[PDB]
Amino acid sequence: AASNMTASQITQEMKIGWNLGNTLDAYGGTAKGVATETSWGNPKTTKAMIDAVKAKGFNTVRIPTTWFPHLDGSNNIDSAWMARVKEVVDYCIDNDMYVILNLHHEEWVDRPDLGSAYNEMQPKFTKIWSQIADAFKDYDQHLIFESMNEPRAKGTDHEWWGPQQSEVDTINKLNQDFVKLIRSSGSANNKNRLLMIPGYCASADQTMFSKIQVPSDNMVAISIHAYVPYDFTMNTAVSDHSTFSTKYSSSLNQTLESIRNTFTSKGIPVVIGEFGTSNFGNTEARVKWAEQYMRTTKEMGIPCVLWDNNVINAPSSAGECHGYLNRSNLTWYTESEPVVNKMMEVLG
Incomplete structure (x- = not known):
């Protein structure tokens, strides 16, 4: 039997990641059951798609998953939904990749009353994570759990900046509940699993990420969206x-160096679980951005996970064109492929 890997070994092997965006995270339609997967216009995920992600050079897949539409009144997770999540996890694990599984667009997390909602949230949060930890109890350290996505006081004047202390407290307490719960599982895989925890709105601004309470646990990484x-x-x-x-190069450097100052220079692991640029018909500029971003993070030892929503064109939402893999035909979108190629060049 192989012995356990450290957090540093895992983040090194992760290399670079790809998000299955606008898929198991989709919600809000008339679609019910496993059909939520296709409700934002993407095809049903296949192993051939994940095979193509690996072939291009990625070694991690993040599977953003929105669970609340698949819960009964007692917070039991629908068994066909759990089986589908596991089927998609296996497409990646069977390719010897790392996987990040989370709770994503939860309407009971992203909420204006977050600062008063801890006692309502705690039993639901723990019942959900207990079921996920048991369903995946025999998965090795290639599988990573992430407590929450972008918890924030949605709709308020401080949704993305300047949180109230009450909201900082709710998030910090739930993150501690999550780590304690996973380590109390009867499975040794869960006791040794790498776990990721976010701060307020998953912020990349030091005013917010410096308020994260780091659990006293040597197998935890901080998650940031950047x-x-x-x-x-x-x-x-x-x-x-x-x-x-x-000016944009200056801004990027300032953000990344603030993460080194607070976390990695002090031995605290970090994963950038979402980053990216929208396709504005500006491929050369996006390539220069990617070269700087990957050169800096490679030296810091921070793995980065690209957001890919399979949208190459969107005239009414021009900032949300995050497509790289054309999932329908297993090719890469011509306008955005050079951006991925630069990332793989730097990491080589």
Whole structure:
């Protein structure tokens, strides 16, 4: 039997990741059951799609999963939904890849009353994680659990900046509950599993990530979303995205160095679980952004997980064109493939 890997060994082997976006995270339609998977316009996921992700050079898949539509009144997870999640996990694990499984667009997490909601949330949160930990109890350390996605006071004047202390407290307490629960599982795989925990809104700004309470656990990583700098990567209020100018290079460097200062220079593992740029017909600028981003994070030892929602064109939402793999025909979208190629070049 192989012995257990450390957090540092795991983050090194993860290398670079790919998110199965707008898929098991989709919600809100008239679709019920496993049919939620296709409700935002993507095809049913196949192993051939994951095979193509591995072939391009990725070694991690994040599977964002929205669970609340698949719960009964007692918070039991529908058995056909759990089986489908496991089927998709296996497409990746069977390819010798790492997998990150989370709770994603939960309407009982992303909520304006987050700062008062701990006692309502705690029993539901623990019952859900207990079921996931048991369903995957015999999976080795290639499988990583992530407590929550972007917990925040949704709809308020502080959804993305400047949280209340009550909201910081709710998130910190639930993260401690999660780590304690996983380590109390009877499975040795769960006792040794790498776990990821976010701060308020998964922020990449030090004012918020410096308020994260780090559990006293040597197999935990901090998760950050870093679509930075936002005015370049996605902001549709900014007209021109054609150039990765010096000011944007300065902004990116400042953000990444703040993560090194708070976390990695102090021995705390970090995973950037979502990053990316939208396709504004600005491929060369996105390539220059990717070269700097990957050169910096490679030296910091931070694995980065690209957001891929299979959308290459969206005239009414031009900031959400995050497609790289054309899932229908197993080719890579021509406008965005050079961005991935630069990432693999740097990491080689």
